[PDB]
């Protein structure tokens, strides 16, 4: 039908965690010169014991053995005008997340797991050139959660790749959704034993060495050798980016609260935790005041750009698809939309 069809990478040396071939889903649209490449999320694992436990409970995120042959685009990947009013006719690409490395892993493997997230992106771009990308006018690299952080790490690498390959007319852009995190203090400190409850700084310090991860070169210059973990955090890597990037971020991101050891039950929140949550949104609000193209509602949620109801969230009377359209036209109707109200779900258009 309108579905994206699975393609496995021809270079079988670029694999998922377990050695199965990586791949991508593609839906071609011959009349359009716009391309949407989406990076999937799904946390990470930074040592053998967590990656083994991840392999037993969430096998889809470390292997391609169970991928379906087709997939339906949703949200900004949907081809239905009612669901994607501005970009429904674009070429759609969906890259599944099977490297557990926040799309940072490079180099090859010895014997346990392989971490080739940055090489998977590179190889998809190579193959897509033979399937019509060579004629593109705009390449928008998008992603959610871990894929959103992966956009910040890879958007300038794709730009330089396409220049080196001889396609300087393609305008490369980035869209990072729910990948803008703070290396802050936990609400209640725990020891870095499990994945989702290890502090953000320590998680990336261990991960980048375990994955052989790479960061943008211009950001690596700003921090001491051995402190490359800084470049995994949006407000530190953003000032050195060269491609234009639109930042979508819930002010109270639920994944951010998870690594901060905050667990929301159906109880009434006490003070100090209410203060902690309130202080989080203010610091994230502060990091965005110099980001011209941003969209930050004051909700407690995670991810949105490939959810079907992304057309319903609005900040100051402007929807998310509208803001992306205004940003699109400005590169050839505001684009800086951050909520001013400081408590969660003060925006009436928050999801449920
Ligand atoms: C600074 C690094 C923090 C990365 C946190 C990533 C969280 C995530 O990737 O969330 C996945 C979501 N549950 C599914 O898509
Ligand atoms: C295939 O991938 C491997 C993995 O790193 C790489 O070393 C090699 O150069 C690639 N070859 C081609 C033709 O893409």
Numbering used by the authors: 86 to 196, 199 to 419, 432 to 451
Publication passage describing the model:
We recently identified the Wnt antagonist Notum, a member of the α/β hydrolase superfamily, as a Wnt deacylase that can remove large (C16) palmitoleate lipids from Wnt ligands. Importantly, Wnt acylation is reversible upon the activity of Notum, a secreted carboxylesterase that acts as a feedback inhibitor of Wnt signalling. Stomach-produced ghrelin is a 28 amino acid-secreted peptide with an eight carbon fatty acid covalently linked to the side chain oxygen atom of the third serine residue. We have provided biochemical and structural evidence showing that the Wnt-deacylating enzyme Notum can also deacylate ghrelin.
We determined the crystal structure, which showed at high resolution how this enzyme engages with the octanoyl lipid substrate. To the best of our knowledge, this is the first reported structure of ghrelin with a cognate deacylase. The interactions between the ghrelin octanoyl lipid and Notum were mainly hydrophobic. The lipid tail interacted with I291, F268, F320, and Y129, while the lipid head interacted with G127, W128, A233, and H389. Hydrogen bonds formed between the octanoyl acid and the backbones of G127, W128, and A233 and the side chain of H389. Compared with the apo Notum structure, all of the interacting residues maintained their side chain conformations, except Y129. The Y129 was repositioned to interact with the octanoyl lipid in the ghrelin complex with (the closest side chain carbon) distances of 3.6 and 3.7 Å to C4 and C5 of the lipid, respectively (for the superimposed apo structure, the equivalent distances were 4.7 and 4.5 Å, respectively). When the peptide was treated with active Notum enzyme, the m/z shifted to 3511.84 with a double-charged peak of 1756.92. The loss of 126.13 Da matched well with an 8-carbon chain, indicating complete removal of the octanoyl lipids. In contrast, when the inactive Notum mutant (S232A) enzyme was used, the mass of the untreated peptide was retained.
